[PDB]
Amino acid sequence: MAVKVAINGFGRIGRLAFRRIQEVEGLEVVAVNDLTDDDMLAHLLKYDTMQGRFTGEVEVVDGGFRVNGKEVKSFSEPDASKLPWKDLNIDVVLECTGFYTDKDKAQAHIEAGAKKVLISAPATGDLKTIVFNTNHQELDGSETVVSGASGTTNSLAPVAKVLNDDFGLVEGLMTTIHAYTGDQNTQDAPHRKGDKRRARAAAENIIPNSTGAAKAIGKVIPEIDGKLDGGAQRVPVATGSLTELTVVLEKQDVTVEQVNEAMKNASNESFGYTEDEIVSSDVVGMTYGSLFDATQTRVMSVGDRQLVKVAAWYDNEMSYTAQLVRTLAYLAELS
Amino acid sequence: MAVKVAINGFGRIGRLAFRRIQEVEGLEVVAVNDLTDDDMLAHLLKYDTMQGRFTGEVEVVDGGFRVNGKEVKSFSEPDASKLPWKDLNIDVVLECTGFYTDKDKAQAHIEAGAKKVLISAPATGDLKTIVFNTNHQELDGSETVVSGASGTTNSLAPVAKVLNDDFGLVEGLMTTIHAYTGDQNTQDAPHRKGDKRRARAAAENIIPNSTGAAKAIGKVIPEIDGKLDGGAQRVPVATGSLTELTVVLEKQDVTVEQVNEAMKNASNESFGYTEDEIVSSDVVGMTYGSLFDATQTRVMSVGDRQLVKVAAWYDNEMSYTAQLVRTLAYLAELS
Amino acid sequence: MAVKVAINGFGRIGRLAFRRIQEVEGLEVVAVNDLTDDDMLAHLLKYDTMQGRFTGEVEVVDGGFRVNGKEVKSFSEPDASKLPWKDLNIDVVLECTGFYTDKDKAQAHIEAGAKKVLISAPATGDLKTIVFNTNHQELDGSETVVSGASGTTNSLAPVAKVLNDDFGLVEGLMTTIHAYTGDQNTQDAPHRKGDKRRARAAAENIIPNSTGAAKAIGKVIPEIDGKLDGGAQRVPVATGSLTELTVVLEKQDVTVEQVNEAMKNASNESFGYTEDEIVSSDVVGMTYGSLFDATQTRVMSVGDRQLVKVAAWYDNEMSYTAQLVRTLAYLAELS
Amino acid sequence: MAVKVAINGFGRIGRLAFRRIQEVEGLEVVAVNDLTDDDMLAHLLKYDTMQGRFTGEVEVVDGGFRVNGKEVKSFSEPDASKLPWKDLNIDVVLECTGFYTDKDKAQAHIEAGAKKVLISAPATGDLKTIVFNTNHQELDGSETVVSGASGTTNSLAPVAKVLNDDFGLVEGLMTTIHAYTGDQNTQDAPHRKGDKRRARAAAENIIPNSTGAAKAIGKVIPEIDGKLDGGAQRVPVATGSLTELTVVLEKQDVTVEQVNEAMKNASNESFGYTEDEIVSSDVVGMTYGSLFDATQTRVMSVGDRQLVKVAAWYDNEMSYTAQLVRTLAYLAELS
Ligand SMILES: NC(=O)c1ccc[n+]([C@@H]2O[C@H](COP(=O)([O-])OP(=O)(O)OC[C@H]3O[C@@H](n4cnc5c(N)ncnc54)[C@H](O)[C@@H]3O)[C@@H](O)[C@H]2O)c1
Ligand SMILES: NC(=O)c1ccc[n+]([C@@H]2O[C@H](COP(=O)([O-])OP(=O)(O)OC[C@H]3O[C@@H](n4cnc5c(N)ncnc54)[C@H](O)[C@@H]3O)[C@@H](O)[C@H]2O)c1
Ligand SMILES: NC(=O)c1ccc[n+]([C@@H]2O[C@H](COP(=O)([O-])OP(=O)(O)OC[C@H]3O[C@@H](n4cnc5c(N)ncnc54)[C@H](O)[C@@H]3O)[C@@H](O)[C@H]2O)c1
Ligand SMILES: NC(=O)c1ccc[n+]([C@@H]2O[C@H](COP(=O)([O-])OP(=O)(O)OC[C@H]3O[C@@H](n4cnc5c(N)ncnc54)[C@H](O)[C@@H]3O)[C@@H](O)[C@H]2O)c1
Ligand SMILES: [Cl-]
């Protein structure tokens, strides 16, 4: 039958990965783990502020919940090493808690009996960081623990690859205007990780913040390692984000048209192209990992010296989740 | 010299109580306790999203911080029983963590050496619940643990008293349209206390939620115990709230004017009166505990049967804080 | 073939009425009028911040736009008396500009050649005010200008009817906690109609405001004329709203359960029932005119005197639009 | 006595300039013009969602309003050529309506009798564009119509000057993450100027949009004419903005520290310097034209090739307004 998936952390990425799996044959979520009870899990699956009402039926049953007639087993175990993955025969854990973002920590799922772990974030340790349709083919099926990178990395990789392949990337700087996330406080309050900015009221501020997306791009595209860096501004939309990239290229006399054309030629189910004057809410729930926006391309030329600026939208939620689940499927399929 | 105050929980209420104590002679905050470091505390005192920049100078120093030339000792101790209150000679603890909202739990501060505790919230146990300028005179100086009630209770009490004194309260229902607070999640997520509504994205929803304010009004005004109940709708403003009360009265043929008049006559530093067409942002940072809005008075008469509706604004932060600090001062002065 | 509909004012209600007519056979929108060009119209139809991407294809063509292979003629004419309705054989104008909310003013469409007008708001003059599934049967086919009421009226009517039929309505008061609309300013600015509250930053305040919904309920349910009144708080969500109604009933010893069952028994495609602890975003895009929320029903009893409170959600946009289009269909079919 | 000022367009910039003039001696606002009545004007002066309650007393009087005992005459006249500026002896009109942003159009105030006009925006035609403390010394007193530039320009100019003087500006690109403003729609609607992005729900989207600030910088700093370009993202905060500038410099091996120090050395009352990890609400109401944020400086070095990124905050309202008022004072003082 299907690939057996357990989701660890039924949060934003967890539940959306659950929804998305509902429309990909060969994958079944058989178990979910988190820190709450079934009443709350079922409820947050059914209702979603940004992504909309869940389409199927959800019902609390014994030991978990039923979704469109399928039993999902649920657990409330903060220590992953104690999860009953061996008895459940879990083929892949989707690790979406935010607390196991390291090869050695995530290993706990393997000890508990899962065959492989896919982490919904950048992760430290000796493992591959994968953006689907940019470098998934670097997976060979011997990996046990894999990172699915970040929303920002997924928005940036296909854009950066085209810039480098077609024009030769000398260097660039990124800013991501990014929806606020669960890691920010509702009101000004002490922040768990001592970040004085993620401390502030999330929905009432433009908030500068760091991201590894550009700095660690070299893990996704080794041939440009060290050539990008940048940061983020977290702003008050609840999901939907934009990556602006300003670069220096080797090729001279570059034009808006050549850049846009090159992006369009690279488009697929991960990397979308648009020429419509859209805004963030238009990309909520979209399944492209990156939507290239040709209306935002600019070229500064002073004499023979040029800066090239481009921008790609991503739903930091659904865009990333759709990539995560593509990498999931590919990863499972290799065994 | 001054009354020695320690603040437990340097959060929204804690920091604002600190600010407000800066302009009230005879009160000095000598200690603060929370779960973070000085860098974070100093920072959140200096900067405040809704309430504005702190006016004085704040500098991180050894074992705490200096504010306008005064040393504040700071601690990072979750178990209150362990705080050095005896060494510091604490006269009153302002208990503003949200975790000691009960007479027996709050007792921990007394064991630790504080003479008295004032809790920035409704609290269970055998103790007095005080709304300044409605029933603060019920304090005699033999109390060790006192509750300052809630924001909503302070908004409501003075309105409820006038209605009862002047018209005879038969019964009523309340809804507070309330700013969202720190116990709501930033994004849809499991809620610590299992509340499926406080679980939702705070700044993106109208959220029905409970409040004891009306049900427990009888602790502040015994003679109307059991006559009020109601709830809240948490909405996306970061601070600033409104209490609507709909009531049945014993007196007949009541008019809008008679109600407004009676409210105006009862106005003081705690209970304000306005006839201007204001909106929530207008009351941010105000120091009335309750601002009666005459433009919102409504009287429904069918034959000889009437419903009377009124509304009072409050800054759930600063209004409550100003009331809290008035009570603190009165409380400390009684010994 | 189909009934020929022209939409006047391609705004929030106009474009959603357009979307909604795409899925109701026997109605075709053949013309649209507004104050802009086709580029803008096509665009606002394609992309909708709260209601999501339009599903079909939209293309600017000559003299209007093409939707799913169908030609829509578009005009840019502020004076309705000059629209080419006679030439286009318009059966019904859906009047959604906010500028023709009066029988005599709306008469301009009839002079221009439309057979009938349906107004997407309360309207003054000698005409029927219709809430589908509460009093649409009051239409006999001799009306030329009809009002579809307001979102609030549509949320309230079916609730008020069950209350009266099953308990005897004595009197009541309403508050609707309501998403902000286009008649509010983005920033504090002079307000076109002199309302000092609708003048304020819409997305940054809780804003009291008037509404005729309750006061004029007797146009929809004559037997309770004069027994309801109340107002609105406009709050920062971009669509989705809640009506709170506090009532006195002739029936004594009423329980929460009795009220809830009576509501459930009246449910249909206009009046939904829920027991889930939902929040405003959960109703965005729903097609019930009114969603009764059983979780919010309260009964305050003091001796034999009771106040009953209930609450019904409505997407002020899509709920109202769904009702408007049901009324449109029924209206057109009577001829 | 004082310089006589009239404010045309008592909008955000108009009212804030009015407040700010209350604390600059030698300036008196004697008259205000807009399109509303006195009730509305007085009210919007008193109450301000982001900027707070006005401190003095405001009272509607005959033919205007009284502020702190001073009579302000008010008018309701859309055609500036008809304003009674000669009878009032206006020395300067502050042109803040957004409808006279051109030398020839603004001439109308001169014909009506004003001696000089200062425009609260970029303006076309033969006139000087002034950022106070960057180029106000280019004013000689023979100017009759002057532009105060934009908030963005005022944020950018001092930053760009330091970059050019100390390192040699080769070229650069700018993005401003900007609070939404009054020219955006509350809900998705046709936009007055045909802009399909400014058409969208302002407080629910990240919205790319154009700005002349970088492109026209050469009007403020001639020696870098043509070297900058860029755009804006309008995001959901009601006021408070950030300018990010990414540049190529002549000087090689530039460091973060060198850049920051050079910015600190240039600081004055128009150009602030900070090393605190602040967020947008922290700059609401600040009087710096530009607040340089040292924590956001980055230097990307690949071999011998560098990009330098910096960022400066501004309250697009109060920062701009304080700059406008300083230019007003200097302008009037030259005659
Ligand atoms: N845009 C995004 O939200 C986004 C995009 C890509 C990746 N990510 C990453 O994915 C991860 C999750 O992000 P999120 O936004 O979904 O966070 P979230 O807070 O919504 O989800 C975390 C969930 O996991 C649960 N959890 C926490 N500790 C646990 C434990 N020890 N055992 C079991 N369950 C536990 C929490 O209760 C919560 O339900 C993070 O690493 C985040 O950085 C987020
Ligand atoms: N926010 C309001 O509108 C408001 C109004 C009236 C009353 N209150 C009440 O005041 C209390 C706190 O309110 P708040 O909004 O400031 O909460 P908050 O979210 O700001 O948190 C308060 C602080 O308590 C600290 N804390 C938590 N546990 C602690 C511990 N064990 N020891 C020491 N410090 C600890 C937290 O780190 C935080 O800084 C609550 O009881 C609340 O209901 C709040
Ligand atoms: N939006 C809601 O929540 C809601 C709910 C129920 C009823 N309504 C009512 O429907 C009507 C429209 O509401 P909306 O919120 O969709 O407004 P809106 O501002 O989005 O739409 C009005 C549209 O009509 C256009 N218009 C204005 N004058 C015109 C004219 N003279 N000729 C042609 N076009 C013109 C405007 O350009 C705009 O597109 C109002 O009466 C409103 O009260 C609104
Ligand atoms: N909002 C900002 O951050 C900001 C910053 C710098 C400059 N500006 C510029 O300042 C100008 C005004 O901006 P705003 O945001 O205060 O706009 P606003 O809409 O808030 O105020 C404009 C005012 O002009 C009045 N008005 C319009 N036409 C008029 C007429 N011809 N005669 C008399 N009064 C008229 C309106 O009633 C309104 O009060 C614009 O040119 C704008 O670009 C805005
Ligand atoms: Cl995150």
Whole-Å CA distances, D231 to B95, B245, D175, D225, D288: 49, 49, 5, 17, 22
Which of A32, A97, A153 should be mutated for ligand 1, with most atoms under 8 A from CB? A97
B13 lines ligand 2 (CB under 6 A): yes
Chain A environment of B190 (Cβ under 8 Å): 11, 34-36, 40-41, 44
Q: Which helix (H) or strand (E) holds C152?
A: helix C151-167
| Cβ(B172)–Cβ(B248) below 8 Å | yes
Task: From C184, C186, C187, give the residue whose CB has the most ligand 4 atoms within 8 Å, as the site to mutate.
Answer: C187
3-class secondary-structure state, position A115: coil
On chain A, the residues whose CB falls within 8 A of the CB of B49 are 187-188, 200-201, 204-205
Residue C36 distance to chain D (closest CA, Å): 6
A181 in contact with ligand 1, CB cutoff 6 A = yes
For residue A136, the number of C-alpha atoms closer than 13 Å in the C-beta half-sphere is 20
Q: What angle do CA B31, B36, B41 make, to 5 degrees?
A: 60
Query: What is the spatial distance between Cα B187 and Cα B179, in angstroms, rounded to a whole number?
Result: 16
**Which chain B residues have a beta carbon less than 8 Å from that of D279?**
47, 49
Find tokens 């805004």 and name the residue. A279
Q: With DSSP H G I counted as helix, E B as strand and the rest as coil, what are the percentages for chain D, rounded to 5?
A: 30, 30, 40
Cβ separation C237–B233 shorter than 8 A: no
Beta carbon of D99 within 6 Å of any ligand 4 atom: yes
DSSP run (H or E) holding C293 = strand C290-293
Atom 3 (ligand 2): residue with closest C-alpha? B316
Residue among C229, C281, C296 minimizing CB distance to B300: C229
Classified as helix, coil or strand, D202 is helix
Q: What tokens appear for A88 in the block?
A: 């459940």
- Verify whether the Cβ–Cβ distance A237 to D204 is below 8 Å: yes
- Taking the CA of residue D138 and the nearest CA in chain B, the distance in Å comes to 35
**Ligand found nearest the CA of D121:** 4
Distance, CA of A60 to chain centre: 29
Q: How big is chain C, counted in residues?
A: 335
How do A27-33 and A3-8 pair as beta strands? parallel
Measured in Å, residue C61 CA sits from the centre of ligand 1 at 47
Q: How far from B250 is each of A73, B163, B259, C132, C253, CA to CA, in Å? A: 58, 10, 13, 40, 20
Q: What is the DSSP letter of C269?
A: S
* Residues within 6 Å of ligand 3 by CB: C 8-14, 33-35, 78, 96-99, 101, 120-121, 150-151, 181-182, 316-317, 320; D 187, 189-190
Q: Name C132's Cβ contacts closer than 8 Å, sequence gap at least 6.
A: C154, C270, C289, C323, C326, C327, C330
Distance of alpha carbon A240 from alpha carbon C53, whole angstroms: 14
Sign of the C-alpha dihedral computed for residues B65, B70, B76 and B78 taken in this order: negative
Length of chain A: 335
Chains that touch D (3 or more CB pairs under 8 A): A, B, C
The amino acid sitting at A302 is V
> Which ligand number lies closest to the CA of residue D181?
4
Residue C153 in tokens: 């009226």
Nearest atom of ligand 2 to the alpha carbon of B182: 19
Q: How far is the CA of D98 from the centre of ligand 4 (A)?
A: 5
Q: Nearest CA to D203 among C176, C16, A279?
A: A279
Please tell me the distance from the alpha carbon of residue D41 to that of residue D265, in angstroms, as a whole number: 42
CA distance to A149, A281, C33, C68, per residue, from C54 (Å): 31, 13, 19, 11
* CB contact (8 A) between residue A194 and residue B37: yes
Question: B183 CA to chain A: closest CA distance, Å?
Answer: 8
d(CA C93, CA C86): 12
String of DSSP letters for C166-213? HH-EEEEEEEEEEE--TTS-SSS---TT--TTTTS-GGG--EEE--ST
Fold classification of D1-149+317-335 (topology level): Rossmann fold (3.40.50)
How near does any CA of chain B get to the CA of D43, in Å?
A: 8
| DSSP one-letter string for D178-195 | EE--TTS-SSS---TT--
Pocket probe mutation, ligand 1, options A37, A38, A96, A132, max atoms within 8 Å of Cβ: A96
**Helix/strand/coil (H/E/C) assignment for every residue in chain B:** CCEEEEEECCCHHHHHHHHHHCCCCCEEEEEEECCCCHHHHHHHHHCCCCCCCCCCCEEEECCEEEECCEEEEEECCCCHHHCCHHHHCCCEEEECCCCCCEHHHHHHHHHCCCCEEEECCCCECCCEECCCCCCHHHCCCCCCEEECCCHHHHHHHHHHHHHHHHHCEEEEEEEEEEECCCCCCCCCCCCCCCCCCCCCCHHHCCEEEECCCCCCHHHCCHHHCCCEEEEEEEECCCCCEEEEEEEEECCCCCCHHHHHHHHHHCCCCCEEEECCCCCHHHHCCCCCCEEEEHHHCEEEEECCEEEEEEEEEECCCHHHHHHHHHHHHHHHHHC
Q: Residue C78: count other Cβ atoms within 10 Å of its Cβ.
A: 10
Count the neighbouring beta carbons within 10 Å of the beta carbon of residue D137: 10
Q: Which residue has the tokens 């609607």?
A: D189
Ligand 4 atom having least distance to the Cα of D12:
16
Angle between helices A151-167 and A256-265 (to 10 degrees): 120
**How far is it, in rounded angstroms, from Cα A55 to Cα A236?**
27
Tell the residue nearest (CA) to atom 20 of ligand 2. Answer: B11
Q: Find the C280 Cα to ligand 5 centroid distance in Å.
A: 25
Contacts of C258 (CB under 8 A, 6+ apart): none
B74 lines ligand 2 (CB under 6 A): no
User: How crowded is residue B148: how many other Cβ atoms within 10 Å of its Cβ?
Assistant: 33
For the purposes of burial, counting CB atoms within 10 Å of the CB of B334, is it exposed (0-12), middle (13-18) or buried (19 or more)?
exposed
Assigned token pair, D330? 């200097």
Mutate to test the interface with D, among C188, C195, C197, C200 (most CBs of D within 10 A): C188
Report the distance separating Cα A80 and Cα A11, nearest Å. Answer: 16
Q: Rounded to whole angstroms, what are the CA distances from A144 to A87, A95, B221, C32, C107? A: 19, 13, 65, 59, 73
Q: Which residues of B touch D (CB under 8 A)?
A: 43, 46-47, 49-50, 52-53, 276-279, 281-282, 284-285
D88–chain B nearest CA distance, Å: 31
Q: Is D40 in the pocket of ligand 4 (CB under 6 A)?
A: no
Q: What is the number of the ligand closest to the CA of A7?
A: 1
Q: How far is CA A239 from the centre of its chain?
A: 12
Q: How far is C168 from chain B, CA to nearest CA, in Å?
A: 13
Show the tokens assigned to A329. Answer: 């499927």
What DSSP element (H or E) covers D28?
Answer: strand D27-33
DSSP-assigned letters across all residues of A153-195: HHHHHHHHHHHHHHH-EEEEEEEEEEE--TTS-SSS---TT--
Residue D242 pairs with which residues in a beta bridge?
A: D177, D313
Which residues, at least 6 apart from C199, have a Cβ–Cβ distance to it below 8 Å?
C185, C188, C189, C190, C191, D40, D43, D44
Integer Cα distance of D199 and D190 in angstroms: 6
Residues with Cβ within 8 Å of residue B238, at least 6 apart in sequence: A187, A201, A203, A204, B49, B50, B179, B180, B203
Same-fold call for A1-149+317-335 versus A150-316: no
Residues before each break in chain B (C–N > 2.5 Å)? none
Going from N- to C-terminal start, the domains of chain D cover 1-149+317-335, 150-316
Alpha-carbon gap: D281 to the closest alpha carbon of chain A (Å): 6
Is the CB of A47 inside a 6 Å radius of any atom of ligand 1?
A: no
Residue of D171, D207, D280 lying closest to A205 (CB–CB): D280
Question: Measured between alpha carbons, how far apart are the two ends of chain C, in Å?
Answer: 14
Report which of C45, C206, A233, C181 is spatially closest to residue D201, judged by C-alpha positions: C181
D13 lines ligand 4 (CB under 6 A): yes
A200 contacts: CB under 8 Å, gap ≥ 6: A184, A185, A188, A207, B47, B49, D279, D281
Q: Contacts by A273-276 with C-beta closer than 8 Å and gap 24+?
A: A274/A313, A276/C43, A276/C46, A276/C47
CATH code, C150-316: 3.30.360.10
φ and ψ at D150, to 5 degrees? -110, 170
CB-proximal residues (5 Å) to ion ligand 5: A 181, 183
Q: Which of A35, A49, A184 sits opposite B188 (nearest CB)?
A: A49
DSSP structure class, residue D281: G
Name the neighbours of B, counting chains with at least 3 Cβ pairs within 8 A.
A, C, D
Distance D47 CA to ligand 1 centre (A): 41
Cα D15 to ligand 4 centre (Å): 10
Count the neighbouring beta carbons within 10 Å of the beta carbon of residue D269.
13
